[PDB]
Amino acid sequence: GIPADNLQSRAKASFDTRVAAAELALARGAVPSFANGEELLYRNSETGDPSFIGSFTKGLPHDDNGAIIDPDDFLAFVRAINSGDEKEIAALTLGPARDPETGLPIWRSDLANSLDLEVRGWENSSAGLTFDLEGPDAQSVAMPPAPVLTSPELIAEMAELYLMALGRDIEFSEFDSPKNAAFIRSAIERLNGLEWFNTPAKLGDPPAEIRRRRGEVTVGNLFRGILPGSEVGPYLSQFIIVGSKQIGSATVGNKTLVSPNAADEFDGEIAYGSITISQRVRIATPGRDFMTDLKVFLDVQDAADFRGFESYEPGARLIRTIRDLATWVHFDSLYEAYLNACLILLANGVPFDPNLPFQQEDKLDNQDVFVNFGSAHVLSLVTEVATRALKAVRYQKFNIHRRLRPEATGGLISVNKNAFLKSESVFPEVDVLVEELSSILDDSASSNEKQNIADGDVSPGKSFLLPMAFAEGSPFHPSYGSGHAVVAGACVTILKAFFDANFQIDQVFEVDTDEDKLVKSSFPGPLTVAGELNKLADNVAIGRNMAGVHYFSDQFESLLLGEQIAIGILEEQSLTYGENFFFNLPKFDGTTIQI
Amino acid sequence: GIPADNLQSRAKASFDTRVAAAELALARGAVPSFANGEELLYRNSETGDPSFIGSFTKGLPHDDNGAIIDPDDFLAFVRAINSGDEKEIAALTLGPARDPETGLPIWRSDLANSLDLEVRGWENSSAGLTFDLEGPDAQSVAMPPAPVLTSPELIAEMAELYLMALGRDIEFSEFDSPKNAAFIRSAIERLNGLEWFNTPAKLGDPPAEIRRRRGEVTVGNLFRGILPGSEVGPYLSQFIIVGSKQIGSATVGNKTLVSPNAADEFDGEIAYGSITISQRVRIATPGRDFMTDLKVFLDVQDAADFRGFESYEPGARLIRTIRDLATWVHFDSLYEAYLNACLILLANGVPFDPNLPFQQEDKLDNQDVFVNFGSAHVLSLVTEVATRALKAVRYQKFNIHRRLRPEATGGLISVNKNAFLKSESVFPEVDVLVEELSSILDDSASSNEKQNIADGDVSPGKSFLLPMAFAEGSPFHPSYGSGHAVVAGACVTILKAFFDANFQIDQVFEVDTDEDKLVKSSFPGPLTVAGELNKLADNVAIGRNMAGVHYFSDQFESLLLGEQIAIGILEEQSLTYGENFFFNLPKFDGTTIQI
Amino acid sequence: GIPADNLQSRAKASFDTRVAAAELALARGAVPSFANGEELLYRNSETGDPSFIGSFTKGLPHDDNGAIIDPDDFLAFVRAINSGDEKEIAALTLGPARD
Amino acid sequence: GIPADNLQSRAKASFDTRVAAAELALARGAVPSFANGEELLYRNSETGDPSFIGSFTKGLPHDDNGAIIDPDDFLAFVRAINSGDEKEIAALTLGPARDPETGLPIWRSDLANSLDLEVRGWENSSAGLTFDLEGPDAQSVAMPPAPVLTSPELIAEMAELYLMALGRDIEFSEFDSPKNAAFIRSAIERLNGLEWFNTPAKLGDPPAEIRRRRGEVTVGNLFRGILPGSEVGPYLSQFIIVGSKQIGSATVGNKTLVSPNAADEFDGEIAYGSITISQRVRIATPGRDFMTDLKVFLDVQDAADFRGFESYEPGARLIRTIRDLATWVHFDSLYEAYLNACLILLANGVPFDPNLPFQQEDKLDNQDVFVNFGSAHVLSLVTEVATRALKAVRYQKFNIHRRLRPEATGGLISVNKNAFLKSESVFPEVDVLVEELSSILDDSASSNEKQNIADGDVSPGKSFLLPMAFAEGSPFHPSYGSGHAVVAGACVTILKAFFDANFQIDQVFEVDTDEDKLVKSSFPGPLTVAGELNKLADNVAIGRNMAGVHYFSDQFESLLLGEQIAIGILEEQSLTYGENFFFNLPKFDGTTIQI
Amino acid sequence: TPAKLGDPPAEIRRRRGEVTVGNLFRGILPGSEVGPYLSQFIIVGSKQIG
Ligand SMILES: [Ca+2]
Ligand SMILES: [Ca+2]
Ligand SMILES: [Ca+2]
């Protein structure tokens, strides 16, 4: 007989497709996650117990030097993370001692006590235990060990964050302007004096380190990411400052119609359906930074809820300063930047990936696209990968590495350096970190003294704390990896698969140095969609660093993790279509995968 | 021994969760879809063949009376829909005869020939064959048979659409104003003269008909939907006209901060992260309707691509007229309205469903929400259900019912009534539909004569065509059900499950009758989130009817279908969480399901 | 009892040997193939479309500079490669214009 | 829903294709193999034990009459065959008594002792237990029982073999020449005096016997096989004597190019890529036959390793005599003849089977062939079937029938006839065989006496042994079936499926009677590819008979077994292609199967 | 110039160094650079029957 296949009922074929996808996912294998070993390394000299200084302990009661008071509070917290039991999380110790009549926390700072602040809790500390109906399971993927406190890498990461905090009110369009030369030149020479940047990796180093190690800092790569496309052209992705084509501009047969609102494109207006999105961001008070006083910093480490304490100027403007990019990433919904990028691309008519079905003229294939392979498809797909990626990064954040946020590291530096001047030893583990950042810390103590004077906040010693752009500092979850960066990675992977990513963009804009408007850039162009989508991912991720809440390595590693999650979802979803097609996807490493 | 369970590796538990969800879906069963029987009922008197006049045939070559020329073109189109083969879809007959030198279509109207229009193709005619990794399979659910051309129901649906087209430039806030009394009163008395509205269902009628049958028309229910909440208060949902709370307004312990941009709330500004969405919509030229001339209408039925031919006024305004709601639903991304509603709810601090985990103060449960049970969760979930719902409605649209769009029905009415005045019989099947709409058709012929004069479009006879708000008329896919309404249904089901849906809204706004601004309504309130989310679903769905592209029954039935799709996804996803919780969901029928 | 193995018919043993080898091959895993990214990188200046100058296009109609005339001819070629359908291969454009 | 099939991962589909093939093979069923019953029939008069005279016992110690000395040696040998255990094989008794001082075997003949010959071992006695990844398992197929020593069929087979040995230096082209008429006519007459050939089968005879029984011997069928095509035209297949078209001969559009080496085609040069294969074979010394002396014969049955002892004339020539065909099959690689034919067919441009995919002009199908359905595919397939066919004949040879080689049967005849001349009875079971061959034996004793005189070998009595063309006689494995003929059957089956087997060959060549060159034959032609490929299989298989190492029945039965093995491989491999096609295969029985 | 740390491993494995007459136009499989350019197996004959 002739070899054949049999049909089955529709219901059974649907069931079998779901199982087959599940089998695909199971066959990929699971990789183990290794942490850097710091967790139990650092010990308390007096008791011999682990001090947990290189670990996330925000929320647990701390002592005056910023170390937790009771190691059992951290060990109970870890057990709670790994079980996910709601009652167990409710029995944890959160916040400082409470007053017997008020029942309210007793804070160290006059500021926190005068506001009657209450405590805030951990955000989804067991989201990494949750399964998902599509994509790689959260625990099946891994991020490599984070940099340790005594490494050249961390030294360079902290130097870069302190300089971003001192240069927060510098305008992106004026990086090469004579008014900022003293700061820019001193920033670059200080970073180029650190071994991470001025010496190459050595044979024998871990591959993950070799891939994220950076070379010589220049004005052209200062504070930028390293995804392909991020170092070409202006700092800011076109997609976070320009508008789109507007309703009313169309080509109808041989006639060209011009929208009566066409100028909105060049004024940061994205056409969103029949309404609009404005790219202008709220303006946080220039020059006002937070958590520059030791007692307020310790209250925030002990959970004081300072959310919502920032002050703003009236109006809005196109992103101008480093601070505005920090403000943008303080409140964005997590797929916001990529959904807005997508809307510009749809409104501007950028073509879909030419390997998708039915992209030719309708006269050749009789089939337009929308639900599948069209705008509705990409609009749901870019947003749905976000929670799958977050589940994976929550497993890394809480269940595996528990890396301390940058503000805690600045806490360790401030305490050690102040003890040193009083001829005392506190946190000897950061002695080399403090010695190598010495000229940077002198500038920061002087900037923090002005901030503390202006706020009327007094604490003993100089303050070498890292100035935060946000009143509450970082969110209530560990630093490695990052929710913004994991989502960026997954979302721009979907968009580069769905759109013709190498299509060129010929109009390059930047924000004017004098007015709140867009001007033609001096960079000729063209740029490609892929490089400006990669740039946008880097802008949102590095924005979190500019706010003081992540390190470089958190961002870069999380971008790669989100990329894997997105690729995994597309592969499993490929079993559902009967058409003959594939997604052409340019990865962050420069190679292409066809799915 | 003591009875127990065993653990398994994480990978295997993830695989087993996916299979278990697949088994849940398989156990729900699949229901058959029945069509109304019209497809092959209507015959051509001369050949005896099926004429397909009650079927969607947009794109296939039509004769001068609007009937397809060759029945085989429709029969080949059906085969192509059911196979999904790309080459088979490419071999179909699309558009009219082409000119041998140009290769361009030969149109009937001077307008289409003067623009050199080309053809447009069908949009995803086989999307209903696609499987999905989550939720009910597209073919496992059903929509009941659509109303037939000779039924009282269709008569009332067409009367309502012609009156919406004549009242397109009437303002929602002026429905009860003396300047519109002659039109409003005549609209209500004519609709109340039709049996659908003035006589109740009879024992023995199909249950689906009894559920969507409407009673007496009044100013308070005129042009409204029937979801619970839609008939209370102002016509327009608060969520499509107001803004939200802005960044800078916060309560920090005992101190209340006021945003310097707080007034933006009351000016239609939604806080979107740190940027904004404006609720003001583009303004289509008032009084300009389309496809009111027979030859241009036949060219559009033969696929002439008129997309992008509308003209607009400069600027934007809060939705004011029926036409503006049509313009809003011409270009919205499909989950746009619900994502914007969600952003208002998050920015205003409306509480999440109190049965979700960790909603108490952090001091009682030590756990904030974001990834799971928080904003990121609902923001991905509301958008991801959209493509699952569209797959189901595409199966109904193309594979089962293939209902003709309202413009084709107006085509049948115009041809029959013109033949009748010349003592001739064309399409006798609509004789009763034409007789019962007689006074309405007199008003419409007079409005269409003015439109055709203004455009310089000439065709023999009077024009009783349904005026379209869009130059191209309906999209290139059948009328029953609707993509907008199926998505509305699924998306507001997710939001009413995730948010505390019965929470009350005490500030009720409407659009001012004199200026482009929001004013306090005369309706006292309060309203609930569920009723205003249901209203919003009805506003977007009924907006498609106001544009002339759907009937009432298309919308209502599609809302119920999307609701089922959403409930199915939530049930399957409930197997992934280890927490103890459930979604409390108020359905469109007034009952609650806990998931 | 003493641990043992059982014999089976020859035919079964032959069947089980072929299945065991298929299982060994399945257990090796499958690795993905990544391409260098050139295919869609190079663009035609006038139209903005991919020019495919870094890709095999032997057989498709070329212009006087050696670049393919129509990008759709390459895209249809790639679809036909991935499906293997004989009729789809036969409908491709091969060679220059004919007399 | 619409019935459907689901996709699965590539890996999973490969795994299910291999399982499906295995299932196909299991579903064919396995047939038992029946032997002829002789193994244990013959008994030793003195002890009553089985004597094993009708079984292969080469290698086991024999007595002076050629019977094994100890029956336990044969029974241990059978156990070793069935287990395959290497140690058990190593513990068997091989060769004669050895000298305590030298360790060397003690032989009977001066010749073997003077050369210090060592023993040679059984070749792969348990290759019939090996499984395979493709095709019918080796024990799943069967050959029918072999002819018994006292049958008419064996009498006929031995008469033919003795006549082949006496005619070894006769030229194929001079079969009907007056110089050979005394020998040819007496050969025909003596074969036509035997019942097997002069009397037809009778109703009730086993069907396998009816199919291989031959009729009246003529010059046209003398020494030929019975596959369709072997009796048409010249004795030797064109593929073992002609060369092929050479590089440089081609048609390029309208221009015909002629190779500068075109004449090579008619001089026996096959184009092998860019180098050549010569059809001229080494020339074994004319008139020199082996094992014509009783003692040397006994040493050979006792394992004396005489391999490599033949002498040759300088140079090479196109196959000319029966001896040259025997020389050809002495050392050929087992698929050599069929690969060489395949190369001739590819170089001459014979078409592939027209039912294969893509064989039309490239302008009609856009697809040339090579890997699949082209030259690389058939080049690997024709050679890979060889080891699968050998495993099955190994099971037949050792595990089932264990048929004595023709040389052993000649030893029985010689011993019995000499005992009779001396008034003694030895091996009474072959009395009838000896009586019916009486005239042939007289000629053979006379030729054997000349051979022994020329070699200086002396043994008591006349010699009626079967003169061997090879010094070592047969290979170290049983006679039924044959490795050359099982491979011939499988390999030509593959070639007839892959090429257009009925294409005609119009140029027919033969080897010249006077010179070493090809001449146009007197047979007009045409011949077909199928007929000449079947003829080639018969030429190689009957050349083994010409050497004295096989009987007729061995070859014909093995050709049928090889055919089945090849068919089973094609059927299992048909599950691996997605194309629509099939192999048209003309079988040895005249019918065609489509796979 | 040699490969650099950070380059793809597949590139490091096939990168070739300084060209000499001894390696000109040769492959890099072990044994290809020893002795004559052409393998013995593409020029020599074999032992013959006899
Ligand atoms: Ca298209
Ligand atoms: Ca809480
Ligand atoms: Ca061909």
Give the residue numbers of D annotated as catalytic, written as ranges.
477, 484
Q: Is E49 exposed, middle or buried (0-12, 13-18, 19+ CB in 10 A)?
A: middle
Bridge partners (DSSP) of residue B62 are: B68
Q: Does B91 touch chain C (CB under 8 A)?
A: no
Report chain B residues whose CB lies below 8 A from the CB of C87: 87
Touch between chain D and chain C: 3 or more Cβ pairs under 8 Å: yes
Planar angle of CA B360, B361, B363, nearest 5 degrees: 125
**Interface contact flag, E5 A203, Cβ < 8 Å:** yes
Task: Fill in the amino acid letter for B68.
Answer: I
Planar angle of CA C72, C77, C83, nearest 5 degrees: 125
Q: Is A377 designated active site?
A: no
Instruction: Give the residue from A139, A165, A159, A162 showing the smallest Cα distance to A147.
Output: A159
DSSP code of residue B68: B
Give the residue on A whose Cα is nearest the Cα of B575: A131
Report chain D residues whose CB lies below 8 A from the CB of A9: 1, 3
Looking up residue B160, the CATH number of its domain turns out to be: 1.10.606.10
Q: Does C28 touch chain B (CB under 8 A)?
A: no
C-alpha to C-alpha distance for B126 and B397, rounded to whole angstroms: 10
C-alpha to C-alpha distance for E20 and A24, rounded to whole angstroms: 50
Instruction: Give the residue from D535, D271, D558 showing the smallest Cα distance to D393.
Output: D558
Q: Is A182 exposed, middle or buried (0-12, 13-18, 19+ CB in 10 A)?
A: exposed
- For residue A100, report the distance from its CA to the centre of ligand 2, in Å: 23
**Interface contact flag, A502 C40, Cβ < 8 Å:** yes
For residue D260, give both structure tokens: 């500068």
Report chain D residues whose CB lies below 8 A from the CB of C12: 26
- For residue A361, report the distance from its CA to the centre of ligand 1, in Å: 5
Which residues span the domain enclosing B115? Answer: 1-595
Report chain E residues whose CB lies below 8 A from the CB of A200: 5
Distances (CA, A) of C16 to D11, D14, D130: 19, 17, 13
DSSP secondary structure string, A290-353?
B--SHHHHHHHHTTB--TT---EEEEEES--BHHHHHHHHHH--TTHHHHHHHHHHHHHTPPBP
Distances (CA, A) of B303 to A221, A389, B69, B84, B548: 52, 43, 14, 21, 17
Q: Is A477 designated active site?
A: yes
C-alpha to C-alpha distance for B86 and B84, rounded to whole angstroms: 6
C-alpha to C-alpha distance for D24 and A595, rounded to whole angstroms: 33
Planar angle of CA A426, A430, A435, nearest 5 degrees: 105
Q: Which chains touch A (3 or more CB pairs under 8 A)?
A: B, C, D, E
For residue B109, give both structure tokens: 């109207």
Q: Does B259 touch chain D (CB under 8 A)?
A: no
Q: Does A309 touch chain B (CB under 8 A)?
A: yes
Q: Does B422 touch chain C (CB under 8 A)?
A: no
Report chain E residues whose CB lies below 8 A from the CB of A205: 5
Torsion sign across C-alpha atoms A162, A165, A167, A172: positive
**Interface contact flag, D311 E49, Cβ < 8 Å:** no
- For residue A90, report the distance from its CA to the centre of ligand 2, in Å: 10
Q: Does D1 touch chain A (CB under 8 A)?
A: yes
Distances (CA, A) of B30 to B27, B566, C93, D343, D425: 9, 16, 45, 60, 89
Other Cβ atoms closer than 10 A to D571: 19
C-alpha to C-alpha distance for A463 and A411, rounded to whole angstroms: 9
Q: Which chains touch E (3 or more CB pairs under 8 A)?
A: A, D
User: What are the E-state strand segments in A119-274?
Assistant: 122-123, 250-252, 255-257, 269-272
Give the residue numbers of B annotated as catalytic, written as ranges.
477, 484
- For residue D86, report the distance from its CA to the centre of ligand 2, in Å: 75
Of the partner residues D4, D9, D575, the one whose CB lies closest to the CB of residue A27: D9
**Interface contact flag, D1 A24, Cβ < 8 Å:** no
Give the residue on A whose Cα is nearest the Cα of E6: A210
| Through-space distance between the first and last CA atoms of chain D, rounded to whole angstroms | 35
**Owner of token pair 């050479």:** D246
Is A487 in contact with A386 (CB distance < 8 Å)?
yes
- Which listed ligand is nearest to B367 at the C-alpha? 2
The Cα of D515 is separated from the nearest Cα of chain A by a number of Å equal to 54
Q: Does D133 touch chain C (CB under 8 A)?
A: yes
Residues making up chain D, counted from first to last: 595
| Through-space distance between the first and last CA atoms of chain A, rounded to whole angstroms | 35
Q: Does C10 touch chain B (CB under 8 A)?
A: no
Is A68 in contact with A76 (CB distance < 8 Å)?
no
Instruction: State the number of CA atoms in the 13 A half-sphere of B367 facing the CB.
Output: 27
Distances (CA, A) of B185 to A273, B161, B190: 34, 16, 9
Report chain A residues whose CB lies below 8 A from the CB of C37: 586, 590-592
Distances (CA, A) of D141 to D388, D389, D399, D537, D561: 12, 10, 13, 21, 8
Residues making up chain C, counted from first to last: 99
**Interface contact flag, D1 B30, Cβ < 8 Å:** yes
CA C71 to chain centre: 19
**Owner of token pair 């006083």:** A293
- Which listed ligand is nearest to D362 at the C-alpha? 3
For chain A, how many structural domains are there in total? 1
C-alpha to C-alpha distance for E11 and E6, rounded to whole angstroms: 10
The Cα of A205 is separated from the nearest Cα of chain E by a number of Å equal to 10
The DSSP H or E segment spanning A196 is helix A195-198
Planar angle of CA B150, B152, B154, nearest 5 degrees: 70
Task: Name residues whose C-beta falls within 8 Å of residue B436's C-beta, 6 or more positions apart in sequence.
Answer: B155, B159, B194
Give the residue on E whose Cα is nearest the Cα of D282: E49
Is B115 in contact with A257 (CB distance < 8 Å)?
no
C-alpha to C-alpha distance for A51 and A74, rounded to whole angstroms: 10
Touch between chain B and chain D: 3 or more Cβ pairs under 8 Å: yes
User: What's the resolution in A?
Assistant: 2.3
Residue B125 annotated in ligand binding: no
C-alpha to C-alpha distance for A153 and D470, rounded to whole angstroms: 80
Bridge partners (DSSP) of residue D26 are: none
Mutate to test the interface with D, among C18, C88, C89 (most CBs of D within 10 A): C18
